[PDB]
Structures are given as C-alpha cells and as structure tokens.
Amino acid sequence: ESPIGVVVSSRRNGPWAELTLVLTPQELDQGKRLLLGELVRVSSGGKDYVGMVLDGYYEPVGRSDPTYTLALAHINQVDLEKEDPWARKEVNFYHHRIVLLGRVVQGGLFAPSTRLLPPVVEARVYRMTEEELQRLLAAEVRTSGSVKAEGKRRYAFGHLAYGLEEGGEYPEVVKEVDPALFVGRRTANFGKTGFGKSNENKVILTLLAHAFPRVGMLILDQNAEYLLQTEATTSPGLAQAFKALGIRGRIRFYTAREEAWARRLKEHLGTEWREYVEVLPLKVDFYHFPELAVALAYQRRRLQGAEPPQYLENAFYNLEDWKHIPDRMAYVYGALRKAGLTPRKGLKIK
Amino acid sequence: ESPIGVVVSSRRNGPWAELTLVLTPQELDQGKRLLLGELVRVSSGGKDYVGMVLDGYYEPVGRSDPTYTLALAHINQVDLEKEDPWARKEVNFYHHRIVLLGRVVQGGLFAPSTRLLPPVVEARVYRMTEEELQRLLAAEVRRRYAFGHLAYGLEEGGEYPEVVKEVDPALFVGRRTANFGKTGFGKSNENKVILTLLAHAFPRVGMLILDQNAEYLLQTEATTSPGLAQAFKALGIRGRIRFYTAREEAWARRLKEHLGTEWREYVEVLPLKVDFYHFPELAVALAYQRRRLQGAEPPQYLENAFYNLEDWKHIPDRMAYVYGALRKAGLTPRKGLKIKYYDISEEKSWGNLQEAMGGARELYSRAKVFSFLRAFHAPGKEANFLETIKEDLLGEKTEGEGKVVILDLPSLGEAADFFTLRLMDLLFDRAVELYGKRQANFLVVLEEAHNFLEDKAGIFYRVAKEGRKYGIGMLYSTQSPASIPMEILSQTENFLVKHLSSEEDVKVLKRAKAPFAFVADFLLSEPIIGYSYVYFEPYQPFVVPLRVKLLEHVLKSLDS
Amino acid sequence: VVLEEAHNFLEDKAGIFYRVAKEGRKYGIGMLYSTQSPASIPMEILSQTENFLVKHLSSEEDVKVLKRAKAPFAFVADFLLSEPIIGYSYVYFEPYQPFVVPLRVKLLEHVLKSLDS
C-alpha cells in the first residue's frame, strides 16, 4: 500500500502521456518488480489514472561509473552483497516507462488519455489491487453525463494474466461478457493452429445457446469437431455441452455417415441421445432433382481449360422446359440410368 | 489576469512560429496548469496573437540533478513538502510549447500565422476569457444557428457551454462536406442536424438521400434520436418527403405508429419498380452479377453482352434478340411496344415473331437468366422510379420548393448499387442538359463513400469533381478517409472529424489539410462520443473542437 | 454463420460469403470466422469486424495488418510475435472497450461446471 518507486520525469510522447519511474536499491532488494504490460495506478493531484508498463532499461543515477565499479569488484574478487554494500547501493537502480491510458470516472465511465501532464513531485505509482482491477475491467466508453444501462446477465470468459511469469496470473480478476456482443456482429478468431481456437469457439457458442434460445446457428463443420470430442483430445463438443446444460431438441446434424455418427453418439451420450441430436442425411435422389445433377456436373473441376461443355450449358437452362415433354425427359432419365444411378422400385418412363 | 509563466525561447518550426513557456514552483503550487490544445493569448510588441498549447515535458532548470535528488529523498524517507521545502523548490518546473496561429485584426478579420518572431523578453502569455473566446470563434479570413460549444477533451475545466459556434447553413449548399469518424460516435446525429438546418433555412433546395442503413426517416430500434420525418413533423414542414421503398406496407405500419394518424401529410411512400424494356443494361448487368456469385465463370455470351450491349443498341437485328429474351423470360411489356425484327405485347404477334426467330442469338435461348428480375419488374413509365425521381428533383413544373427523396436501399437487395449508379448517371445527364436555364440545386447524401469514390472513372467521382457547376452538393461519410482519393480530400470544403481507429486514416487528414496537423494525435487516442473537430473553408482560420448539439435541443430551439 | 478457414471464402469479392460478411448486419445475420492468417482477409472486411480474439501469430505481415486495422493492438504486437503461449488470448470488443485485454480463456469443462450452479 505504498508507492513502488519515484517518478523522475514526465512528458507527452506522440498521442500518449508517459512518465519515467525509478526503482531504488530498497525496492530492488525487497523483491519489488514491474512486469511489461502490467497495469498500475497513478495518483497525481487527487486523481487516479490507469497506467501501463511499456519499457525497462538500466541507466546510471548521479555521478557514477557502474561499468568501472562492477568490473573492479569482479577483478578484485570482492563480493558486493556480503562485503562493501556501500558501492552496491550506488548502482542498484532501474528505470521503467509508464503510459497513461486514461481514468475511470462517474459510475464506471472511461475517460481516455489526458490533457493534463503531471509534475514530477506530484505523481506516484501504486500496485493495483484485485478489486481495482475488477472495477477497471468493467469500465466502458460512454456518453458524458449519463447513467450506465446495467441489467442483462454476464458470464465469465477468462481471467487476467501477463504471460507465463510466476505472480502474473489473477484467477479472481475475470472478464465478463454479455453474449449480445456476438449476435448480429462479426467476430474474428486469429492465431496459429493448436493454440485454443476450438475451445474459444465452443465457449462462445455454448454461451450464445444458453443466453439466447431464439438465435439459431449454421455451423459448417469442416474439421468435424463441433459435435463430439475428437479422438486426439478430450474437450467436450456441443452435443455433450447441451446434454450437460439440459437443452433438448435443438441440434440438427446433417451428414452422409449417419450409422457411424449414431454409433459414436450412442457411446458418448447414452441410450437417450435421440432427445439431444437429430441426425439427417446429406444424400438426394437425382431422379427427383435432375437440375441438381446438371448443376453439379456443370460446375465441376474443369482442369486446365476452363470451358464448360455446350451441351451441359444448354441442358442447365432448358431442363425446366424439357420437364413438360416425356420424349425429352426420357433422355435425361436414361442418361442418369446409363451413368449408373440405381432408380426406385417401379420407376416408369414413356 | 497576470501572465501564466515566463517565455524562455522562441523560433520558427516549419510553417509556424512557436515559443517555449516555463512554469515555476510557486505557480505550480498555486495550482496553475495548461491543457494541451488550449487556446491562449500572446502579447508581444503591443500586438495580440492567438496561441495553442502543443506540448509539455519536464526538463532540469539551472544546475541540478533531479533524478539523484528525488531518488535520494525517496531512499532516506523524506517528504519534500514538509521536511525539505528547498529541495522541492529547485526541481518543480514544467515546460510547454505554444504555437502562434495568427491574430485578430480590424473588424473581426483574421490574419493567419506571422512573419515576425517575438524576442523572449517581450512576449507574455495570458489565459483567454469567455468574451475573447466568443469573439475569436466568429473571426474570418478576408441568420446563424448554434452548432456546438467549445470543449477540450473530457477534462474538468475544459468545457465552455457559453462559447458557442454558429454556422450559416449556406456553406453546405452546393459544396462538399466530409463526415469522418468511427461508427457509433455521432455521425448520424451530425448528419441529421445538418439536414434539418438546411431544410429549415432553405425551403427551395432538394435532397437525395441514399440510405444504406435505413436510419434517416424514423428513429431506429436502438436509440430514441428523432428521425427526419419526425423532425419535419415537429418543425411543421408538410408535403416534402418522398420515401421510395419495396416494403410500403411495412413502412406505412411504422409511419402511423410514430407520426400519428396524419402521417400522410408529411411522407409519401412509393414503390421501387423499373422497366427492363427501356433499361436492358440493368437487366444484363444484374444477370451477370447473379452469376459469378452462385459459382464463377460467367458465360462467353453473357460477358460479351455485358460490354457490347451499347453497340447492340444501334443494330435492330441484335436488339430484337435481347427483347425476345426478356419476353420469353416472362417480363410483361407495355401495350403498344413493337420491334422491327410486330406487337410483342399483343398475344398473337408474339407467336409469329417467336416462330420466325451470334452473341445475341445465343443469349436468346438462355432466357431464364432474367427470371429473377421479375422480383422488381413493372411496365410503363409512371411505375419507373428512375423517371419519377428525375422529375421530382428536376421537374419543369416542380421548380424550387425543394423535395427530400429518400431511398430504402436495403429492400432492393443485390440490385441497390446498380440502381443507385444508374439513377445518379441519369440525374447528372439531366442536370447537364438543363444548364443555362436553371440550376439543379440539390444535395446528395452518400454513406460508405469509400465504396463509390474509389475509381476515377465513376459517376460519383465525376459528380464530386464537377457538381458545383450545376448546383449539386455532396455530403459523404466514409469512416476510412485513407480510401478517398487525395484530389477529393483536398477539394472538399467542409470537414467534420470524429475519433478514428486507424493511424493511416489520421495521417491522410494532415497530408490533405495543413491545419489538421495539431489534432491528429488527439484523434488517435481519444474515443469520445459526440466530440468533433470542425473546419469550414475558406474563411475559418483553424480547426475547432466542439461538443455538437443534439437534434432534440436543435428542434426545441428552432420551434421558438 | 460459423465458418472455418475463412480465407478460402472471403478472398473473392464477388462471392456470396464476402457479400454476407459485408451486408449481413442489415438483415440480422452474424458471422464468426477463424483464419490463422489475417493478412489473407481483405482489409475491407477487417476494418468492419467488431470482435477480435487474437492468439500467437508468427508473421510480421499478420501483425502489421492487425495494427493497421486496429490501432489499440499496437501495445501488444511485440508480445504476439515472440510469445507462443497456448490458451493465451488478446480480446477486443468494439466500439466501447478502452484497451485490448490479455486473458487465459476458461475451459468448456469449467464453464459447464459453473453454469449449473
């Protein structure tokens, strides 16, 4: 509950106000440190600002020659810690750079940046507490002189961390998201492969399903990972999440391997899985939809030369007119039969 | 009244003169400060200049080692305020930079910049008063409505509700206005205020609003900010709004709810149907777009037609094939239409022509490519909204008195861009035809401008370049200024800039206009809603930061 | 609409998926897309996205496009290049979030276990 160091300078660098902090031998020996990207509190003239640690470097303080001092101590086989602490007290300093992001005012509004530059003798830097971090992660930009809306429920999405350093993780400082941020808007999930994309997406989809039961989803499962846990992991899928949450009759799974998928669903959801997932086929009878077959054959790979066939082109448009003439429809049905599509039992042409 | 600090240096830094100010420990202890971007008075040699605070930094004064002194005081557990009043007296200085913008002369005129550089012992810096700020905001280089009031960020002591900037709503008529800013920071309110002021002040100027977001007619489902129809109802303007849409029933159900049972006195709802026997270029282009979106590789005949229909228009043999293609697709023509391969409208001559009958020949067979056009097809010329809007905005009978045409672009789906481009081209051609007899005298309200101004061979680009000759004004919003050509950026007359999320977007502003060099850094790190930087050429000295008034208050002031 | 490997579908500016990503907000259609390569996504789509969840990226081109699209991501671009941490994300939701937030995202197991209480 004390200042971390001493502020020795401040200025305006580009669009941001920054200040310089010096950690002295007392702080350094007591094990006090600042992490890059850490959020701190800055008090200046009875007002609190949010600051971020941007830099750290070593510089001499006063009239000293740290290189010569340390080299001489090393040469003379002198231990600075146990022996001769007076020379160790004059080199044990460190410098940090801190940017002022803004401040929290009124009932949680965020006022960004600042137009007031703090004098050196006024500013002080404090380590932010857990409650302050919780109140800071909930601040939002808003119209001045208004009142926060409040209301709709929020869910925990993650907790604050500063990398993999010990002491840089705050399991109690969670960020809570209103799932309405995801409905009707665009979300981008960037990053390399294998770093958490699937878990993030599944959490988002589960939160949407729990909070907005009237919003549907169309998932184009290219990797086959949004229904059940994969053999190369044990993270549950949407079907298991919905079974845990008690949501029935919402998942319609369209596939062409219904037997295998139902086999897996039986083992992963029990004998009652028909109440949570509904399996449907991705196969069609081309004798009922000859236009689909024509379009498929017309829009195929077209290796090398990109010239669609003229006969297929003509058929693509005129097949709808041909349907009123059995003499013309018999050729299409015979084409399918000769290609090798097994018809129904009792299909009759004229 | 006394000077703030002491001037210790001056110089010329590029196209401007600047000076350095120092605040001493006594003044700092008294609580005196300078806000960045604040306007101050500079007295030098009997003359008064306007200055702006650009910078602030800490620097040692005299012979001292502030870092060593402060570190040692911290180490020894000493309180400077109490235990050592003298150690705190040698390190408590602060430095500021002030740029001289010009001076106010004679009868409220402004002389920009300066050619004299003040000696250090002559200059003094004073804090502006409200009367001086009011007189300075009205100066120009050579009725009105309140637009906003002066404010410096969100800082306490940086807002002046009485320092109001008032604009004559004639700097918007016939000129170019740019509205830049991130989404959700005041663009809608600013645009609606400008349009309401224009409508009230000049009842003889028409508007063409290309409403991509459907937000200008009625209050949206998010906020309660009044729409333009409700503003007109409040102001008592009758018989001026023509709303073209493809969902007249749905829109008339909302209009009654919001405007009462008399809503028909303020708005006329009209359909958005066209005739493809008179605009077959739209048919061909829409078919071409409808392909390559459900796949790829538009056919050779379709690609040929898309480019050579204009040449086909002079060969009746080739034109008849396109007309027959539309007729087979099933678009009802108007009675009396004939081709010279025949009364295509007549139910019997069509059979003879079809039995009687190249790229056009190939396109004839594939007649179903136009089927979807039946969604927005209608025969005749009274149905043609392209013609109806043309007479609404440039009619011989409807001279003056203004008309506000608003398009419901979303209801058009995929054809909105083509329809808008065709309408703009038609209107520009008519306005060029009318030159020498009367002026077009209307304003085009364009959203997502970066999509239409990108290419220099476009109708909207040509309108931006040459509209001022025929009295056509433009008001465009883009949110991404870096996508707008620098010629248009430099030729634009009015600028309203809000918080921008891109450094390149901020940079282009200064590269286009020099006076915007002093606010670029503020724009990139201050997400404030309703806070704008305004610059109206050619009589405004410098950019002014404003809190813009709301439409509700503007209406409440206009009523009385 | 939940779409994977969005760079295969959003690159074509005459395509239905580009059209949906550009105009779907007018009809109440959202989109959630994952690419692992922002430099491939068109800048017009990037500038119009609302929510960002960014994990480790190994390409300076990707970091440059990220910072060009969204200025607030300039404070963490150096961490993103040099720190391959699994489960560590930088989140930014528009338009009223002050700064980008680094998070350990909760696991689905924990979310399910806490949603039943």
DSSP track, B497-548: E---S-HHHHHHHHHH-GGGGTTHHHHTT---TTEEEEEETTT--S-EEEEE
Q: Spell out which residues of chain C touch residue A235, defining contact as CB-CB under 8 Å.
A: 107-109
DSSP symbol at B338: B
Q: Where are the alpha helices (DSSP H) in B41-92?
A: 66-75
Question: If you count DSSP H runs as helices and E runs as strands, how many of each does chain A have, helices first?
Answer: 10, 12
CA distance B287 to A113: 52
Closest CA to B327 of B364, B352, B362: B364
The 3-state DSSP class for residue A159 equals: strand
Beta strand ranges found along A271-339 (DSSP E): 277-281
The DSSP annotation for A35-77 comes to -TT-EEEEESSS-EEEEEEEEEE----SS--HHHHHHHHHHTT
Q: Spell out which residues of chain A touch residue C51, defining contact as CB-CB under 8 Å.
A: 181-182, 185-188
Yes or no: say if C28 and A184 are a contact pair by the CB < 8 Å rule: yes
* B57 beta partners: A11, B95
Residue B187 half-sphere exposure, CB side, CA atoms within 13 Å?
A: 23
Q: Spell out which residues of chain A touch residue C28, defining contact as CB-CB under 8 Å.
A: 184
For chain B, give the number of residues: 560
Yes or no: say if A133 and A173 are a contact pair by the CB < 8 Å rule: yes
Q: To which H or E segment does residue C81 belong? A: helix C77-82
* Alpha-carbon gap: A245 to the closest alpha carbon of chain B (Å): 31
> Chain C: residue nearest B479 by CA?
C47
Yes or no: say if A309 and A303 are a contact pair by the CB < 8 Å rule: no
Closest CA to A238 of A284, A260, A269: A269
Closest CA to B179 of B509, B477, B556: B477
Closest CA to A119 of B31, B9, B71, B4: B31
**Interface check B35 vs C, CB under 8 A:** no
Residue A188 in tokens: 């981008």
DSSP symbol at B368: G
CA distance B531 to B514: 21
CA distance B59 to A275: 73
Q: How far apart are the first and last CA of chain B?
A: 39
Residues 6+ apart with CB under 8 A from A156: A174, A175, A176, C106, C111, C114
Residue B250 half-sphere exposure, CB side, CA atoms within 13 Å?
A: 7
Q: Which amino acid is at A122?
A: E
Q: How far apart are the first and last CA of chain C?
A: 30
DSSP symbol at B349: H
Q: How many CB atoms lie within 10 A of CB B16?
A: 18
Q: In what order do the strands lie in the sheet with B494-497?
A: B159-167, B145-151, B544-548, B531-536, B494-497, B176-180, B472-477, B442-447, B206-211, B404-408, B241-244, B267-270
CB-CB under 8 Å, B293 with C15 = yes
Yes or no: say if A314 and A328 are a contact pair by the CB < 8 Å rule: no
| Helix (H), strand (E), coil (C) string for A99-141 | EEEEEEECCCEEEECCCCCCCCCCCEEEECCHHHHHHHHCCEC
CA distance B315 to B321: 11
User: How does strand B206-211 pair with strand B442-447?
Assistant: parallel
Q: Where are the alpha helices (DSSP H) in B260-380?
A: 280-290, 300-312, 316-329, 349-356, 359-365
Residue B540 in tokens: 């405004």
Closest CA to B375 of B292, B290, B302: B290
CA distance A100 to A109: 16
Residues 6+ apart with CB under 8 A from A305: none
Ramachandran sector of residue A254 (left: φ over 0; alpha: ψ -120 to 50; beta: rest): beta
Burial classification of residue B401, based on how many CB atoms lie within 10 Å of its CB (0-12 exposed, 13-18 middle, 19 or more buried): exposed
Q: Between the CA of residue B416 and those of B207, B234, C76, what are the distances in Å?
A: 18, 31, 41
CA distance B463 to B450: 14
CA distance B217 to B264: 14
Residue A74 half-sphere exposure, CB side, CA atoms within 13 Å?
A: 6
* A110 beta partners: A104
Residue A305 in tokens: 């030369």
Q: Which amino acid is at A20?
A: T
Q: Best mutation site among B522, B525, B548, B553 for testing chain A: the one with the most A CBs within 10 Å?
A: B525
Closest CA to B98 of B41, B17, B19, B16: B19
Residue B289 in tokens: 């777009």
Q: Which amino acid is at A58?
A: Y
User: How does strand A109-112 pair with strand A94-105?
Assistant: antiparallel
Yes or no: say if A205 and C40 are a contact pair by the CB < 8 Å rule: no
Q: Spell out which residues of chain A touch residue C55, defining contact as CB-CB under 8 Å.
A: 190-192, 195-197
CA distance B296 to B120: 72
Beta strand ranges found along chain A (DSSP E): 6-13, 16-23, 39-43, 48-57, 94-105, 109-112, 124-127, 155-161, 169-177, 186-190, 251-255, 277-281
Yes or no: say if A208 and A179 are a contact pair by the CB < 8 Å rule: yes
Q: Which amino acid is at C8?
A: N
**Residue A320 φ then ψ, to 5°:** -65, -35
Query: Tokens 């077009």 sit at which residue?
Result: B440
CB-CB under 8 Å, C75 with A54 = yes
DSSP symbol at B369: G
Which experimental technique did the depositors report for determining this structure? cryo-EM
Closest CA to B340 of B321, B358, B355: B321
By Cβ distance, the residue of C91, C105, C108 closest to A241 is C108
Q: In what order do the strands lie in the sheet with A155-161?
A: A169-177, A155-161, C101-105, C88-93, C51-54, A186-190, C31-34, C2-4
The 3-state DSSP class for residue A314 equals: helix
CA distance A115 to B545: 14
Q: Between the CA of residue B535 and those of A304, B87, B172, B538, what are the distances in Å?
A: 57, 47, 12, 9
Query: After what residue numbers is chain B broken, C–N > 2.5 angstroms?
Result: 142, 341, 357
Q: Between the CA of residue B483 and those of A236, A283, B234, B256, B508, what are the distances in Å?
A: 45, 47, 38, 40, 9
* A22 beta partners: A6, A95
Neighbours of chain A (3+ CB pairs under 8 A): B, C
CA distance B292 to C73: 36
Closest CA to A60 of A12, A14, A83, A94: A94
CA distance B373 to B329: 9
Query: Tokens 């448009």 sit at which residue?
Result: A317
Interface of A with C in 118-177 (CB under 8 A): 137, 139-142, 155-164, 169, 175, 177
**Residue A214 φ then ψ, to 5°:** -105, 5
Query: Tokens 């465009």 sit at which residue?
Result: B476
Maximum Cα–Cα distance across chain C: 48
By Cβ distance, the residue of A102, A164, A217 closest to C85 is A164
CA distance A191 to A194: 9
Maximum Cα–Cα distance across chain A: 111
* Alpha-carbon gap: A215 to the closest alpha carbon of chain C (Å): 10
Q: How many CB atoms lie within 10 A of CB A203?
A: 24
CA distance B194 to B172: 8
Yes or no: say if A227 and A240 are a contact pair by the CB < 8 Å rule: no
Q: Which amino acid is at B437?
A: K
Neighbours of chain C (3+ CB pairs under 8 A): A, B
Closest CA to C47 of B213, A188, B512, A190: A188
CA distance B414 to A66: 71
Closest CA to B100 of B91, B110, B90: B110
Residues 6+ apart with CB under 8 A from A35: A53, A162, A163, A165, A168
CA distance B380 to B275: 7
> Chain C: residue nearest B288 by CA?
C14
* Number of CB pairs, chain A paired with chain C, less than 8 A apart: 203
Find the Cα–Cα–Cα–Cα dihedral B195, B199, B200, B203, rounded to 10°.
Answer: 160
Query: After what residue numbers is chain C broken, C–N > 2.5 angstroms?
Result: none
Question: A165-190: buried (b, 16+ CB within 10 Å) or exposed (e) per residue?
Answer: eeeeebeebbbebebebbebbbbbbb
Closest CA to B12 of B121, B114, B120, B125: B114
CA distance B154 to B166: 22
Resolution attained, angstroms: 2.7
Q: Between the CA of residue A157 and those of A213, B479, C35, what are the distances in Å?
A: 19, 31, 21
**Residue A113 φ then ψ, to 5°:** 50, -150
The 3-state DSSP class for residue C34 equals: strand
**Residue A139 φ then ψ, to 5°:** -75, 145
Q: Spell out which residues of chain C touch residue A244, defining contact as CB-CB under 8 Å.
A: 112, 116
Residues 6+ apart with CB under 8 A from B86: none
Residues 6+ apart with CB under 8 A from B437: none
